Amino acid sequence: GPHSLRYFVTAVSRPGLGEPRYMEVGYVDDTEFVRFDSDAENPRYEPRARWMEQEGPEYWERETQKAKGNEQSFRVDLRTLLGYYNQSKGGSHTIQVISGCEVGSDGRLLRGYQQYAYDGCDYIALNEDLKTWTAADMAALITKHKWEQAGEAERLRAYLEGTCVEWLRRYLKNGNATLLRTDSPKAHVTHHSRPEDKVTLRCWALGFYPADITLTWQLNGEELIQDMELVETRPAGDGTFQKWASVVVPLGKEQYYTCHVYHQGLPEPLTLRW
Amino acid sequence: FAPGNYPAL
């Protein structure tokens, strides 16, 4: 299937407490593979997945130098935005960026993107065309104009279509045993009493990879999506994922409800019941 | 391989 290479950047000012906190976290698909954190003893880019042991020392040295430069550019940004928004130097503020590319199963580019937020709200974003920007407010309009005069979109586009794609392909090759595997979900159902002769049935899916999955409950051959409660799919600490979905049913009628689990590692979807 | 050179806002 398709794959993605993403970099999540966060810079957070802390007036009275020194320099902003700066972090970069890189992902291939939904697996963390590299990270930089300014609050580390000796901040450096580090591997977060075993397969990254395949890069030599020069890789780490370059990524580290880049991160240090980025840290300084975001420090400048935090100051600049105080000016654009006419805010005080006493408050903490946050800049976030997500940059990435996605390829299909054949390795060809599907899409690229870069989006910025300030204090949790959209700031500026590269358009789907990889040629122009869209600005959320008049501050971002200042940025758009700067970036247009400097030709930044062209350089970013070259990164997104080029470098980003080539390195993603390389990671998929190097980390194939991890990234291209399939771990099938194991499922089970738990049962919990409630007042008013009702019961909560919870369908668990455990130990799966990749993260995409669908869990539904059915009655009378219909999905009950409207009445379910669930959690967002979540990492389980070892590179696999888990999820649950529950429904509340009448007591004594549990046998009429079935949980269904659909996943890449399930040629036929699982069907379970309490 | 990370973006380098995030242009200033």
Partner: protein, 98 residues
């Protein structure tokens, strides 16, 4: 400002005496400043690993704390979180029967 959702769960269904992994997934929060501590019988667990820091489409933050552990019939575990959206720290216990 968004208040964190706090989820505590094990990697494997808990079996007394069998090694496992305990997770505290803290999500949908903003601003990013936060303190997350995993506790065993009320005492901080040392060397908890922080990982999987990301943000969603609405820019809220997500992060995982996790640690290896072997459950026993007596030990209790929780995750305590301090964030500006909450007046008091929030302590969420692991529910092994969920």
């Amino acid at each position: 400002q968004k208040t964190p959702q706090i989820q505590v769960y094990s990697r494997h269904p808990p079996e007394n005496g069998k090694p496992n992994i305990l997770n505290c997934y803290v999500t949908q929060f903003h601003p990013p400043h936060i303190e997350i501590q995993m506790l065993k019988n009320g005492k901080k667990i040392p060397k908890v690993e922080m990982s999987d820091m990301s943000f969603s489409k609405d820019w809220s933050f997500y992060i995982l704390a996790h640690t290896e552990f072997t459950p026993t019939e007596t030990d209790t575990y929780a995750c305590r979180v301090k964030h500006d959206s909450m007046a008091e720290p929030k302590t969420v216990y692991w529910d092994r029967d969920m």
